[PDB]
Coordinates of C-alpha atoms and ligand atoms in Angstrom, one line a residue:
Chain A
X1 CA 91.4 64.1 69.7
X2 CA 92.3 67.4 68.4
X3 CA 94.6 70.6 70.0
X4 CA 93.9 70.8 73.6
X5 CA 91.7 74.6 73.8
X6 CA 92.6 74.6 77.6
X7 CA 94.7 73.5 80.5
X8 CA 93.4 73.1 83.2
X9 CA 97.3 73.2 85.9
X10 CA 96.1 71.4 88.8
X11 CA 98.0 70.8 92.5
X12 CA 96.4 68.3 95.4
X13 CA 97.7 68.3 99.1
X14 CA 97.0 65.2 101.1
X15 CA 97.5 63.0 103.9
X16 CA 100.4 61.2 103.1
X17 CA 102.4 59.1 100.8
X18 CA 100.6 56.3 97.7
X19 CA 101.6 53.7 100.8
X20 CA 99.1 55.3 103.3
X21 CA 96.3 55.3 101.6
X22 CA 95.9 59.0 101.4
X23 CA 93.3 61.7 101.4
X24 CA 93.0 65.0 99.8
X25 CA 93.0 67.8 102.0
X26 CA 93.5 70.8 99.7
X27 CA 93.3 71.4 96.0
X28 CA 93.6 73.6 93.5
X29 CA 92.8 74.3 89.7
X30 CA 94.1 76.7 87.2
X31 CA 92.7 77.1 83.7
X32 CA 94.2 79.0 81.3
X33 CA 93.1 78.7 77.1
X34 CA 95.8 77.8 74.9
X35 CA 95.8 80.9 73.3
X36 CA 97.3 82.9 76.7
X37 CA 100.0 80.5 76.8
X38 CA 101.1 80.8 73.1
X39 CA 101.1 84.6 73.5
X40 CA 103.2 84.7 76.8
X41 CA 106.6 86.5 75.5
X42 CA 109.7 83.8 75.1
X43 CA 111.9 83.2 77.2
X44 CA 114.8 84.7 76.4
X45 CA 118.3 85.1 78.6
X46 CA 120.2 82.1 80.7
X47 CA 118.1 82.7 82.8
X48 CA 115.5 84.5 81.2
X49 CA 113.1 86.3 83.8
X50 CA 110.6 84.1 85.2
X51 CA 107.1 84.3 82.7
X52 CA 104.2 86.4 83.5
X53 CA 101.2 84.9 84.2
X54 CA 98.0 85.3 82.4
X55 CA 95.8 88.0 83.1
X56 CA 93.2 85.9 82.0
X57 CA 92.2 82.6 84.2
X58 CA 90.4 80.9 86.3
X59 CA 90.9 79.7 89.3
X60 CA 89.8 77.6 92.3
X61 CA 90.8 76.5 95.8
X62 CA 89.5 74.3 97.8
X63 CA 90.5 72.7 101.7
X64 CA 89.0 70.0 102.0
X65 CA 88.6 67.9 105.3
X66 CA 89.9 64.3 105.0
X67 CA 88.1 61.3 106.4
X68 CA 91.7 60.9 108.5
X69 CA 94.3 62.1 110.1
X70 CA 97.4 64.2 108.0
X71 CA 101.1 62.1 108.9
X72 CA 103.2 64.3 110.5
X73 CA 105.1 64.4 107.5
X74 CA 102.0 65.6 105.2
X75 CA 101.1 68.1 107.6
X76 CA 104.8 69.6 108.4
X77 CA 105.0 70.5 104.8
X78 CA 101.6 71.6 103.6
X79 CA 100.6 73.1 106.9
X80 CA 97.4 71.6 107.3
X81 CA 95.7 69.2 110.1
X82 CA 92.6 67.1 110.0
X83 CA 91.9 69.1 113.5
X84 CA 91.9 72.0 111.6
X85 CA 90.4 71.6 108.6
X86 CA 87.4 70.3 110.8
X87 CA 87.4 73.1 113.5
X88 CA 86.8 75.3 110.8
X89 CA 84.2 73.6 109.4
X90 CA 85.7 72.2 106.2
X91 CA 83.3 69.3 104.6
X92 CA 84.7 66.0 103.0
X93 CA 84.8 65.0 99.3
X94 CA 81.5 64.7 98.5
X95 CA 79.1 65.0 95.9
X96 CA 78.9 68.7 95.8
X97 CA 82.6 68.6 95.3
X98 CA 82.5 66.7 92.3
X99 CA 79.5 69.2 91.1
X100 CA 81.4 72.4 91.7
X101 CA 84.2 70.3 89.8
X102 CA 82.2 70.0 86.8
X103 CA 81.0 73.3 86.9
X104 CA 84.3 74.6 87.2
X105 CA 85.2 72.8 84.3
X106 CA 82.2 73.2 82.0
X107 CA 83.3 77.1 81.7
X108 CA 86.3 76.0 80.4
X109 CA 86.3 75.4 76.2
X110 CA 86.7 71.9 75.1
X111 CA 89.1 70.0 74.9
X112 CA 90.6 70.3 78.5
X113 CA 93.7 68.5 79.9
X114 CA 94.6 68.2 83.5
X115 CA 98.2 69.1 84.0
X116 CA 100.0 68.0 87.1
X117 CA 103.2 67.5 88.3
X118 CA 103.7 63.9 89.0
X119 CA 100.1 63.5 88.3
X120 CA 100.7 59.4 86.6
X121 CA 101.3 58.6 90.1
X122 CA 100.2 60.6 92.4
X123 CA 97.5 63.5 91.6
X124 CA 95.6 61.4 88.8
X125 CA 95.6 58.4 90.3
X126 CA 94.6 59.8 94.2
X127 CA 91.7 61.8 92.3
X128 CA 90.2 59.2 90.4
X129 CA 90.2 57.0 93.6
X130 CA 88.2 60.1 95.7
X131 CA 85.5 60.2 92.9
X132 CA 85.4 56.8 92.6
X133 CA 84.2 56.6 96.4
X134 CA 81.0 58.8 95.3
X135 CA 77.8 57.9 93.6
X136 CA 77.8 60.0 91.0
X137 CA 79.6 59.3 87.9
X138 CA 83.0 61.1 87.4
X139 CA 82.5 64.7 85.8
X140 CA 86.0 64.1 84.6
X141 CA 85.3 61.2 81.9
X142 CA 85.8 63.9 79.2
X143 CA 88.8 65.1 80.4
X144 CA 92.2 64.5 79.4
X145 CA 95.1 64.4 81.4
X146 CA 99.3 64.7 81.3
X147 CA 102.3 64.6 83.6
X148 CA 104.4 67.3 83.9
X149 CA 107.4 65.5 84.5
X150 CA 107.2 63.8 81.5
X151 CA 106.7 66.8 79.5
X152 CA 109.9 69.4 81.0
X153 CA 112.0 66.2 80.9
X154 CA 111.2 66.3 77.0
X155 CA 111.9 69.9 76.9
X156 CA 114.6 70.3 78.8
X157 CA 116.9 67.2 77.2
X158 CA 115.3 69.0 73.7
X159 CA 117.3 72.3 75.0
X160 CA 120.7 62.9 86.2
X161 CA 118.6 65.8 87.3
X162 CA 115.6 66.0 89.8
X163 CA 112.3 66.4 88.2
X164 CA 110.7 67.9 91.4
X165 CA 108.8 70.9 90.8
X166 CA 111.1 73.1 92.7
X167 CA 114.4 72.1 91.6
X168 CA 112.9 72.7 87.7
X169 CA 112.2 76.1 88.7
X170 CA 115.1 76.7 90.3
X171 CA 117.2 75.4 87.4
X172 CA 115.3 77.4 84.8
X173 CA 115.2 80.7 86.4
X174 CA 117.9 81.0 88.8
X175 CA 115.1 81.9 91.8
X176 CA 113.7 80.3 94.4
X177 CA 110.2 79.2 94.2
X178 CA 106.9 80.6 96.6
X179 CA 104.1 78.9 99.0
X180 CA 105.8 75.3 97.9
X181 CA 103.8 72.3 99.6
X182 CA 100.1 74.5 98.9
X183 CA 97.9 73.8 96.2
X184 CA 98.1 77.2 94.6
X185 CA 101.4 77.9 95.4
X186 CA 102.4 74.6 93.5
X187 CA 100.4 75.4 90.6
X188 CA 101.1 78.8 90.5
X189 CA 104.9 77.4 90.1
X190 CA 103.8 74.7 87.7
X191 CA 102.4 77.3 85.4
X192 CA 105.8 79.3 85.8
X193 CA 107.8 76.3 84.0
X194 CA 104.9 75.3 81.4
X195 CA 105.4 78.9 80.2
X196 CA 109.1 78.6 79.7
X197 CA 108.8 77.3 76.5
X198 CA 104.6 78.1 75.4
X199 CA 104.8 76.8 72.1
X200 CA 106.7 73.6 72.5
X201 CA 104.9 72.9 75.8
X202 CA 101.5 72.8 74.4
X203 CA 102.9 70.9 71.3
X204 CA 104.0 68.3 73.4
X205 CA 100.8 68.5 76.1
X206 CA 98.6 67.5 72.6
X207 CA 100.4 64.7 71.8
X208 CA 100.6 63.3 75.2
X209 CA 97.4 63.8 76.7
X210 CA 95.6 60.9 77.1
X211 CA 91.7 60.6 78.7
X212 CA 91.9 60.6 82.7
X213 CA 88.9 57.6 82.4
X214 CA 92.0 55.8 81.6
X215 CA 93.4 56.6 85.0
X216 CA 93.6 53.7 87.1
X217 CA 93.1 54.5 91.0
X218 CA 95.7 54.8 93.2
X219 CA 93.7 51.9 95.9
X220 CA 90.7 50.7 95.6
Chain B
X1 CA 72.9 92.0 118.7
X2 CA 72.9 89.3 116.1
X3 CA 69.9 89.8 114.0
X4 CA 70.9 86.6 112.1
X5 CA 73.3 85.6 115.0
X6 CA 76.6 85.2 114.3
X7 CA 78.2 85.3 110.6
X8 CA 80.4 81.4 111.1
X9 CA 82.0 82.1 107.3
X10 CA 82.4 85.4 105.8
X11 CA 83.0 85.8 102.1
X12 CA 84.8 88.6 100.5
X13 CA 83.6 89.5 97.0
X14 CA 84.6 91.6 94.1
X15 CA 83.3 92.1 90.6
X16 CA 85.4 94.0 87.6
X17 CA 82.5 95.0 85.0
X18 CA 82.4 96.4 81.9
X19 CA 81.7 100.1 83.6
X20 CA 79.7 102.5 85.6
X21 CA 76.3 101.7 86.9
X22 CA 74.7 104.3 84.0
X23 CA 76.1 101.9 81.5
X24 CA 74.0 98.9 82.5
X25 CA 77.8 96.9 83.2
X26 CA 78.0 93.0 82.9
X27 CA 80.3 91.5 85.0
X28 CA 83.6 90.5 83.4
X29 CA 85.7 89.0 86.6
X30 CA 84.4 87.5 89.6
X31 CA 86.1 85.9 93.3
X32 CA 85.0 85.0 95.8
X33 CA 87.5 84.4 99.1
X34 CA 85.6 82.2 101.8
X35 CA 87.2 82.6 105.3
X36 CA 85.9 80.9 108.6
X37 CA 85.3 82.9 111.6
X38 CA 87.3 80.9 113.2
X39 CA 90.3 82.1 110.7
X40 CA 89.9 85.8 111.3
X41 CA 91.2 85.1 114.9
X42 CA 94.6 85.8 113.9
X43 CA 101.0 97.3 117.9
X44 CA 103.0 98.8 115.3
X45 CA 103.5 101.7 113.7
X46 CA 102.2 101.7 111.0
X47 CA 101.3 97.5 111.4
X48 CA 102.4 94.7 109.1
X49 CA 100.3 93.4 106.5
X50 CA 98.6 90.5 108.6
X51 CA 99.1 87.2 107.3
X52 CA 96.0 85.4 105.5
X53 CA 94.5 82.4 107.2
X54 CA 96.3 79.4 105.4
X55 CA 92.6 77.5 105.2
X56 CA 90.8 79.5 102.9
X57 CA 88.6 78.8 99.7
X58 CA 89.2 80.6 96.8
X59 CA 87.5 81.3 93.2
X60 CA 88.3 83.7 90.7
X61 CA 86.5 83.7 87.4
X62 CA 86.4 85.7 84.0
X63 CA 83.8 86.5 82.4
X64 CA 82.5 87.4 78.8
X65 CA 80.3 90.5 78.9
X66 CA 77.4 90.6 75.8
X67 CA 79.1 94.2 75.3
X68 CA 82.3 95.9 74.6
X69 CA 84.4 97.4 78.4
X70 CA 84.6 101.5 78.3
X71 CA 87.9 102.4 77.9
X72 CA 88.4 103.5 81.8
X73 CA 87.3 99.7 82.9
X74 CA 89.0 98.3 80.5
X75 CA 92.5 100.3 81.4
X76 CA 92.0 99.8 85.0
X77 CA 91.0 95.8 84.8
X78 CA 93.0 94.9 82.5
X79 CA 89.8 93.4 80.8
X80 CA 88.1 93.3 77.3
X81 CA 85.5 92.0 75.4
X82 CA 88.1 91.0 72.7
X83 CA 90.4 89.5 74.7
X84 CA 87.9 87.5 77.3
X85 CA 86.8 86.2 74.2
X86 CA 90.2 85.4 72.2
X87 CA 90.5 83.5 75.5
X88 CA 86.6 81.7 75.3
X89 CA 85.5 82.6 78.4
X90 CA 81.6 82.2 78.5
X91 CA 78.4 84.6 79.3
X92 CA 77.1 84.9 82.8
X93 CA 74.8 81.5 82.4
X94 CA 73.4 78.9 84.7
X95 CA 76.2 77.1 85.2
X96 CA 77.9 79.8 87.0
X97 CA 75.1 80.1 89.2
X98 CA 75.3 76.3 89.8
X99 CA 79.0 76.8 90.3
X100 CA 78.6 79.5 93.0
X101 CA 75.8 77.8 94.5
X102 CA 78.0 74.3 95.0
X103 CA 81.0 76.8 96.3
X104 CA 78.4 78.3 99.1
X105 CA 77.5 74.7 99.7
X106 CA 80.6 74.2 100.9
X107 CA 80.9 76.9 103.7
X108 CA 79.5 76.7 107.1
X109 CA 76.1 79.0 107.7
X110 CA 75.3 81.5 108.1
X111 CA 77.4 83.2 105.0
X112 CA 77.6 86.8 104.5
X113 CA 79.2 88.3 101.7
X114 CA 81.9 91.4 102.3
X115 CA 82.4 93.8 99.2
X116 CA 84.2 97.3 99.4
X117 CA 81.0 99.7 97.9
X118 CA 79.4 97.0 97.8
X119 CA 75.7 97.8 98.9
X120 CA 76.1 100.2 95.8
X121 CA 78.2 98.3 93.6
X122 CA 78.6 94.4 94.0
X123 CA 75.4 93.5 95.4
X124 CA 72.8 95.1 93.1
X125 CA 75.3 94.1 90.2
X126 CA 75.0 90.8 91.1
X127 CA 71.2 90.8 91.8
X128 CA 71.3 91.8 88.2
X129 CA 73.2 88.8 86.7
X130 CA 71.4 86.4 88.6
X131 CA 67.9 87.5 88.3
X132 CA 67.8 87.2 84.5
X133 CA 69.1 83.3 84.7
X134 CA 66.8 80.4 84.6
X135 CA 68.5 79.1 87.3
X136 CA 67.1 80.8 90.9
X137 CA 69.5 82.5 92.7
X138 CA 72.1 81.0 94.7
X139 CA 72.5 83.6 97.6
X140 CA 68.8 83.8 98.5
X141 CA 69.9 82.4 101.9
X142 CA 73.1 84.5 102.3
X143 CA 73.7 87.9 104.2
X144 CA 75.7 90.8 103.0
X145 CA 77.5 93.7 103.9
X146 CA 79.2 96.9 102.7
X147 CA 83.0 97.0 104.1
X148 CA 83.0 101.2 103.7
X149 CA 80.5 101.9 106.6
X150 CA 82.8 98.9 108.9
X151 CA 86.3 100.6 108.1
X152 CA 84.4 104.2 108.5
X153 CA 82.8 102.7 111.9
X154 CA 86.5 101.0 113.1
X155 CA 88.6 103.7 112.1
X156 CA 86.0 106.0 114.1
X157 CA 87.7 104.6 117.4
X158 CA 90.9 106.8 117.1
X159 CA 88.8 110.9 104.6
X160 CA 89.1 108.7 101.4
X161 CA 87.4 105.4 102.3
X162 CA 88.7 103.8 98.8
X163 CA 89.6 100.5 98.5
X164 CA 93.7 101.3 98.0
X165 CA 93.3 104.5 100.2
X166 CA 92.6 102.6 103.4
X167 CA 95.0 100.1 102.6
X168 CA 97.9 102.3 102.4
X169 CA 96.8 104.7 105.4
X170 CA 96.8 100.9 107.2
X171 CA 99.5 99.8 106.2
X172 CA 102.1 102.9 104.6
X173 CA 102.0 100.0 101.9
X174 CA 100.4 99.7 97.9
X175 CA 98.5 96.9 97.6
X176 CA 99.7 94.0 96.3
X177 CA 97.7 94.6 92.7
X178 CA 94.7 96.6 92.5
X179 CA 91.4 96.4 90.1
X180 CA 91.8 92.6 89.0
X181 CA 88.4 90.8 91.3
X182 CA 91.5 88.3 93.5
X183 CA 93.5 91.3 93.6
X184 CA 90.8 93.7 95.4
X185 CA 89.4 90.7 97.3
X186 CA 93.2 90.1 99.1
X187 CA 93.3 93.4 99.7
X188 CA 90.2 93.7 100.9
X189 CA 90.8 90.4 103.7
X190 CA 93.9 92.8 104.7
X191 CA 91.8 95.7 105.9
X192 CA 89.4 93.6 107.6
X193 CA 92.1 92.0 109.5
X194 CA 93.3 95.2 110.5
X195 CA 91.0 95.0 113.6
X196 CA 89.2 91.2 113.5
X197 CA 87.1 91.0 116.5
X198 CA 85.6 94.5 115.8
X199 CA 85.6 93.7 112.5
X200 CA 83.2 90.5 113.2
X201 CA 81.2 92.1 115.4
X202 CA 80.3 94.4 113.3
X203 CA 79.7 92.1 110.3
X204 CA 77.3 90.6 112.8
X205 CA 75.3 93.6 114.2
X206 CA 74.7 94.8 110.3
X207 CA 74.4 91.8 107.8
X208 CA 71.4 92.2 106.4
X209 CA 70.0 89.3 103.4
X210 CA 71.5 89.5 100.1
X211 CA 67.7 88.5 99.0
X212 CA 66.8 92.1 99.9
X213 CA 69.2 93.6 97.9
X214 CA 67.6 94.9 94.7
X215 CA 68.9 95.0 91.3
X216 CA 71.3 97.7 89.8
X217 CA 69.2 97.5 86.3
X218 CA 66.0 95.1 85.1
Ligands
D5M301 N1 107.6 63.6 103.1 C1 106.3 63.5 103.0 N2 105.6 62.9 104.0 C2 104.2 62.7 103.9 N3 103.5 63.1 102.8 C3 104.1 63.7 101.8 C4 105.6 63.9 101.8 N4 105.9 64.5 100.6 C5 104.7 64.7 99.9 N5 103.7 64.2 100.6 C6 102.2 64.1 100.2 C7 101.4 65.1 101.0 C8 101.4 66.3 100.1 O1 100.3 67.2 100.4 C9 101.3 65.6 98.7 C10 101.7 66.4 97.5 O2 102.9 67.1 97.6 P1 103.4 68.3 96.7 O3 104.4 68.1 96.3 O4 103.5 69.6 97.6 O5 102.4 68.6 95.7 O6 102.1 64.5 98.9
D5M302 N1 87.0 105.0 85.7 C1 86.1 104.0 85.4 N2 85.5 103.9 84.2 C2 84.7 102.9 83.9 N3 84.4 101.9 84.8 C3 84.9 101.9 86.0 C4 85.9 103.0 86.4 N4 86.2 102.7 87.7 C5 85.6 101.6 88.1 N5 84.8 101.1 87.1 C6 84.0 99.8 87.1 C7 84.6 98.7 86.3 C8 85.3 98.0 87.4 O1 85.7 96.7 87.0 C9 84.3 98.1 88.5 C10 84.8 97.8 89.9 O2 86.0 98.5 90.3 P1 86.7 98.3 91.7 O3 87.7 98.7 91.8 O4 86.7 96.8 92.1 O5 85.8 99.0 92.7 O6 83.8 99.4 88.4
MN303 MN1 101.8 68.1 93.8
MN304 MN1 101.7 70.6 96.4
MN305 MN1 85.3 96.5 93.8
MN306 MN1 88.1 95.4 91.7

């Protein structure tokens, strides 16, 4: 594959932990073209102030009611209930989910790559296992995907710790992160530390991604 | 009364375009903030901002316009041709329509749409975009309604009826950052929190079908 044209930062909330079999009850996608990330001023300072974000993107958010109940631990932190999601008439992950998906993504320029924060083992794996329970084939079979993890550990050894998504922030920019434990919040973050270092981050993202049909679910 | 009996999701909208009505604008940003009744159920002086809902469905979208942004859009927005493109963002086209109608899909009926101006504004603009895609419109089944003749009717009970001017008389507070489509949409949720029962029942007595609207330009 070539240079990834966009990235598409992306955050799911769900019902639990890998053990419990868990269901997505919020998520969120962010996709911003290479070219704003490469223009986003470096970081300069220790710390340096904390990037701002593109003025160009796109963005969705979805709740999404799951087909059981949040653990208490799930829904302490993400503030969301099965109850709810379903009072207010949230609907499951269906078919028109995986549509509005595709759509969402087709406006994007090709190549895309899913980046996630601890997506190998939980985000990639927990969404290929939700599309995986529908008909339709996945929209996502063109899509490439990274962790990351993977990919601040590399920069930040190139400039032991947690890899968490708040403690990087924190340790970059000397400030406390917003709306943790929410889809956009979480992404909104994630795109905070991709742009600490633009040029090297995207370097890294195209020789890493790799094609989310590769993904293997998290339970079958 | 309820002519289309009670609105179970509202859906606040705002478009940033390439200009004036005159100018035959495109729309270059577009979200869309879906909130269920249920959520707008949420004394001082002046009040604080109210808090929005935490289940909420959000989409915010750019836009490339077939022509350049005057230069008083463009300032304001924060938008241009140049740059929407530098960044590839694509033509209003089918899929968008697609898009929106899978987002609507996903809200409880019936739907109506809240804009600030936007019986003069949002909604013919809109009629516009779709109409000249293959794809039939998406909204032909959802309601609409303007959120300057609800303020004007709830501030009634007890003169600049702007988007940022209501705001601040509100809430002696800026909002958070105006003329970007999320931005305007936020702020717009704020205001209609400001009094939500009233705010609802009004919605209900005027929503009238998007599928009447009629086009800004043909
Ligand atoms: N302690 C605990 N108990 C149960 N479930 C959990 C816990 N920590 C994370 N998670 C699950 C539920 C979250 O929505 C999801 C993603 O966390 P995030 O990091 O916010 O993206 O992981
Ligand atoms: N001064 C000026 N020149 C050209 N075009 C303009 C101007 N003011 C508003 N607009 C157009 C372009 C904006 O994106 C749209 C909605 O503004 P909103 O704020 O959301 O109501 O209206
Ligand atoms: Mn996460
Ligand atoms: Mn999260
Ligand atoms: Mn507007
Ligand atoms: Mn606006």
């Amino acid at each position: 594959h070539g240079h990834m044209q966009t990235l598409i930062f992306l955050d799911l909330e769900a019902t639990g932990l890998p053990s419990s079999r868990p269901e997505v009850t919020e998520l969120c996608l962010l996709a911003v073209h290479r070219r704003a990330l490469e223009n986003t001023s470096i970081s300069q300072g220790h710390p340096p102030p904390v990037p701002r974000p593109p003025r160009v993107v796109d963005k969705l958010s979805l709740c999404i009611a799951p087909g059981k109940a949040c653990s208490p631990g799930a829904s302490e932190i993400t503030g969301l209930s099965k109850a709810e999601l379903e009072v207010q008439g949230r609907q499951r992950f269906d078919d028109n989910l995986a549509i509005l998906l595709r759509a969402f993504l087709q406006r994007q320029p090709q190549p895309c790559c899913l980046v996630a924060h601890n997506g190998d083992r939980y985000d990639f794996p927990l969404l290929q296992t939700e599309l995986a329970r529908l008909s339709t084939p996945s929209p996502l079979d063109g899509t490439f995907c990274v962790d990351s993890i993977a990919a601040l550990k590399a920069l930040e050894q190139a400039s032991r710790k947690s890899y968490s998504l708040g403690s990087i922030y924190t340790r970059l920019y000397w400030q406390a992160p917003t709306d943790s434990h929410t889809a956009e919040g979480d992404v909104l973050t994630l795109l905070s530390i991709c742009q600490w270092k633009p040029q090297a981050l995207l370097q890294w993202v195209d020789e890493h991604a790799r094609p989310f049909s590769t993904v293997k679910p998290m339970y079958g």
